[model samples]
Target: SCTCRRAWICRWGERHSGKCIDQKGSTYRLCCRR
Candidate 1:
């Protein structure tokens, strides 16, 4: 699997968090904790 958190942290900072929007327009919480 692709580790998006690694790239996200590099660009967005260590406290960055993300979520994905599904085709149905629902949001899923995906976190990268350090």
Candidate 2:
């Protein structure tokens, strides 16, 4: 799994599943996978 601040660049955005893994400063690290 992985995290992409830009949701458009996540591997989980199409065929995988993911959740809020972590946050970056004031952002949600865009919980995702690649």
Candidate 3:
């Protein structure tokens, strides 16, 4: 699994799953390969 700050971009072979919200209140897009 991987994490991307931008919703539109991720490392090669990764797919966007959904949005990630952290305890710090920062949001990022979730990326993963399965």
Candidate 4:
């Protein structure tokens, strides 16, 4: 239920146009396993 959101950041922390054709989802490996 997600995609590889392509993002960019210049040295000035400026974002630019980008794209992503690949992606994945979170793997519930753990969560405050107390």
Which candidate leads the pack in lDDT?
3
Candidate 1 stretches greater than 4 Å from native? 1-16, 20-26
Instruction: Tell me the tens digit of each residue's lDDT in model 3 across 1-34.
Output: 3463554556667877764554321455567756
Estimate TM-scores for all models: 0.22, 0.19, 0.39, 0.19
Alpha-carbon local distance difference test for all models: 0.36, 0.41, 0.57, 0.28
Q: Is candidate 1 or candidate 2 better by lDDT?
A: 2
* Candidate 2 regions with alpha-carbon error over 4 angstroms: 11-14, 24-34
Please give the lDDT score at residue 22 for candidate 3.
Answer: 49
1-34: candidate 4 lDDT, tens digit per residue: 1223323322343333333334421332111111
Residue 28 of model 2, lDDT score? 30
Q: What TM-score does prediction 2 earn?
A: 0.19
Q: Write the per-residue lDDT of candidate 1 for residues 1-34, one digit (tens) a residue.
A: 1123323234333343554343321433344446
Residue-pair clashes per candidate, as listed? 0, 0, 0, 0
- Candidate number that wins on lDDT, 2 or 4: 2
Best-matching candidate per TM-score: 3
Model 1 lDDT-worst window of ten: 1-10
